[PDB]
Ligand binder design. Structure first.
Ligand SMILES: *C(=N)[C@H](C[C@@H]1CCNC1=O)NC(=O)[C@@H]1[C@@H]2[C@H](CN1C(=O)[C@@H](NC(=O)C(F)(F)F)C(C)(C)C)C2(C)C
Ligand SMILES: *C(=N)[C@H](C[C@@H]1CCNC1=O)NC(=O)[C@@H]1[C@@H]2[C@H](CN1C(=O)[C@@H](NC(=O)C(F)(F)F)C(C)(C)C)C2(C)C
Lengths: 306, 306
């Protein structure tokens, strides 16, 4: 029993981290086969980041201008290209520790683990969600860019996030591994702000099921509700609409606990209208929305990875 | 910016996990050099665990009765011995991925990362604290025993916990790597309960400093207090006494923020007496006590590991 914010084991990703230096700017890169992926603003001075012309800055660079270090070993860059907001450095050595991997673009509400790195070296690992406003609530400092987010499926690492920048209120924004930003943000040091965020309803429901599985059941009421009536109440409290797709994804937890999804919805409705009355659920005084239905199943059933 | 519950990178420890099977009981082992460490109740049937005589059960075992699997490869056991509540299986092959390591016994209030494993394979990683009542708030299922807790110092893994059992209210208990339990618990399936837990005061203060570093400052008041007067208030609210050793450990965060420790204590005192008035600190509605002063420094300064 017990329920914690669990990250994926980070070992497969640790073996892919390198440091990339261009001039005086150093950040992290991801070394897969004979390519190193990293944020394109490695080629910027501090001055350039206020209004960079990345295409222009990259013309004046050659291969030898990129210093790629994998531990104690320098990797010679033998080609380079830019794909949206990421640079791809071809190196003369394939990473022998390259795991089976995929590049995926995740949807808002889905979760992933972040391996926060500095100078190509890991600092720590934590779990995050892609917020509905396309930010993540991370923990990143200067030099953290190029740190990646990922999910694991048995032996396959699905990379879904590269870190690029921090937005007001201390939230974070970045790209998929094709260099396309999540959200309407740009890699330029100019005033930018995320839109209003919303609560990930399907994840709150998943976490209420995790609470029931752990014997924390005080919030279960005797009612049911329709999907439409629930979504009207959720709208008022800045909760995302619950779709039939979400109901289907909650099926396994609903079947395991014997609580219909719409019954859980009625219990969540009461919590939204009345509060928790200074009570806790799974030790938290707030409803948690950064566990997906699969996160709950993986933690409560002991799914492992190779 | 940002502040999250961060675990250590788990790669060095992943390379040490194996599965140990004796008869029909399978759990996790830790493979360091040519020794595999695991909980001694691997030698028990389900029947034996109600009242095991571990010494007796182990006489009737020989080396070949232990099946140790490291991935796809069986490791031949060539010797065995019992040290308190852990078995030590000597194997014919040294683990080539053995990191620089130490066995340490941590103190209540100190934190560590847990690599939760099943059948020798990792499921996830999360951060925990040794509670003052010598339990940990983990997430463990059947087959999780032998999962370990650890800290990293540059390239050295300090192993501090082996998982053995679950106690009422869904909390967990185990041993150091010498097999000595934390707390007054025994590896027998009989009714056992942890004593009343307390809040780790020095860690709450560390986390308030993390909040200030992140610009969450609303709780800072204009007062100071003496150490004695603070500890009288903390006693009432089931907080551990703050010692001069704790004040000294908080020095770096106090110097960084320019807030004297006893001034922070006055702000914490007001939070204890008045509550947070439905406000949050670093996104939490409750005071958090599972970040040590070093955890805060390591996260907010970007300390990395090799
Ligand atoms: C990568 N190493 C850093 C990570 C930042 C640093 C502090 N916390 C983080 O997550 N990325 C940057 O410094 C990027 C980068 C220029 C400026 N930048 C920012 O994150 C800035 N944010 C913005 O300008 C705004 F408002 F658009 F979000 C900063 C003020 C430094 C937080 C470039 C090329 C966008
Ligand atoms: C190791 N694989 C398991 C981990 C347990 C299983 C469920 N969650 C966990 O953390 N360890 C055990 O099953 C140990 C073990 C016998 C029984 N046991 C327990 O954890 C039991 N607890 C107790 O009997 C009590 F009350 F003392 F805490 C159980 C009721 C199964 C939770 C031995 C040899 C102690």
């Amino acid at each position: 029993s017990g329920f914690r914010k669990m990250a994926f084991p980070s070992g497969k990703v640790e073996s892919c981290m390198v440091q990339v230096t261009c001039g005086t700017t150093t950040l992290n890169g991801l070394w897969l086969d004979d390519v190193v992926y990293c944020p394109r603003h490695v080629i910027c001075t501090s001055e350039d980041m206020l209004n960079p012309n990345y295409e222009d800055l990259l013309i004046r660079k050659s291969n030898h201008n990129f210093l790629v270090q994998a531990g104690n070993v320098q990797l010679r860059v033998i080609g380079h290209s830019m794909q949206n907001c990421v640079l791809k450095l071809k190196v003369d050595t394939a990473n022998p520790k390259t795991p089976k991997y995929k590049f995926v673009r995740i949807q808002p509400g889905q979760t992933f683990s972040v391996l926060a790195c500095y100078n190509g070296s890991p600092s720590g690992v934590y779990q995050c969600a892609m917020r509905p406003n396309f930010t993540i609530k991370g923990s990143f400092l200067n030099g953290s860019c190029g740190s990646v987010g990922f999910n694991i499926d048995y032996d396959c690492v699905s990379f879904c996030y590269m870190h690029h920048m921090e937005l007001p209120t201390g939230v974070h924004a970045g790209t998929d591994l094709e260099g396309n930003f999540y959200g309407p943000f740009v890699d330029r040091q100019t005033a930018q702000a995320a839109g209003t965020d919303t609560t990930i309803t399907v994840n709150v429901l998943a976490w209420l099921y995790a609470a029931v599985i752990n014997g924390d059941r005080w919030f279960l009421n005797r009612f049911t509700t329709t999907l439409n009536d629930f979504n009207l109440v959720a709208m008022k409290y800045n909760y995302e609409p619950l779709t039939q797709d979400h109901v289907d994804i909650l099926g396994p937890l609903s079947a395991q606990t014997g609580i219909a999804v719409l019954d859980m919805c009625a219990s969540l409705k009461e919590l939204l209208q009345n509060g928790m009355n200074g009570r806790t659920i799974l030790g938290s005084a707030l409803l948690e929305d950064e566990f997906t239905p699969f996160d709950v199943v993986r933690q409560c059933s002991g799914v492992t990875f190779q």
